[PDB]
Amino acid sequence: SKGEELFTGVVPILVELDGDVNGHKFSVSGEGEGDATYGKLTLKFICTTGKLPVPWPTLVTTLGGGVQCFSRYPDHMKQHDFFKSAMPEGYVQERTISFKDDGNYKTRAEVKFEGDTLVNRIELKGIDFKEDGNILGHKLEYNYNSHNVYITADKQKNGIKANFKIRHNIEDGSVQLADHYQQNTPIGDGPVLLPDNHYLSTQSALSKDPNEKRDHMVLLEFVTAAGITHGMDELY
């Protein structure tokens, strides 16, 4: 597509989140870069309102997985890249994140280019969370498990749909399931690529900046598209 040409090199990213989880109002500001050629995302997020009322791992898919336009789509699979095709005008990404035996997050994000910078403006609404559950009781470990984002086309809305499961490690050795339902629709009226069924192999690594005193999260994320058959092995 025409949109993929904007991702051939290193692109600066800005992430801004406005959230409310059970009446707890918070804001997150993120800065970094993405290099789609390697499916690499390098981002540092800071809670500008003080202490984050939810665990940092619960926000990774909204903060880092909000810019899936940085996924590495192998050459044989490039006609299936919806994300980049909607650029520069961008896309609206909506999610319903359901935490098993707890509450849910409803997110709406507008992802587009503001000059040569890729921006992700998010509004997060969290409801029905237990006072001392795994989320509000901060019982989730500061780590992450690799997952696959299963994508399907939504021809009616000229976009895509995605379904995936996030497994958050709890401090006692248990697992907190976070079911994700995703919908993406283009902002512009230009032609986009409607993909066949495939997935994004996503690997997230969380760390801390030793020189940072504010509540933060340093994220290194690798996203690679796969799941579509090719005849490349016959060439060898």
UniProtKB/Swiss-Prot annotation:
Reported impact of D102E: In mut1.27; shifts fluorescence lifetime from 3.03 to 2.85 ns
Keyword Cytoplasm: no
Pfam family, one: GFP
Effect of Q68H: In P4; leads to no detectable fluorescence. In mut2.2; shifts fluorescence lifetime from 3.03 to 1.94 ns. In mut3.3; shifts fluorescence lifetime from 3.03 to 1.88 ns
Known outcome of mutating K78R: In Topaz; shifts the major emission and exitation peak up to 20 nm
Posttranslational mods: Contains a chromophore consisting of modified amino acid residues. Maturation of the chromophore requires nothing other than molecular oxygen.
InterPro entries according to UniProt: GFP, GFP-related, Green_fluorescent_prot
Keyword entries, A-Z: Chromophore, Luminescence, Photoprotein
SUPFAM superfamilies, sorted: GFP-like
Protein name, per record: Green fluorescent protein
Source organism phylogeny: Eukaryota, Metazoa, Cnidaria, Hydrozoa, Hydroidolina
Gene encoding the protein: GFP
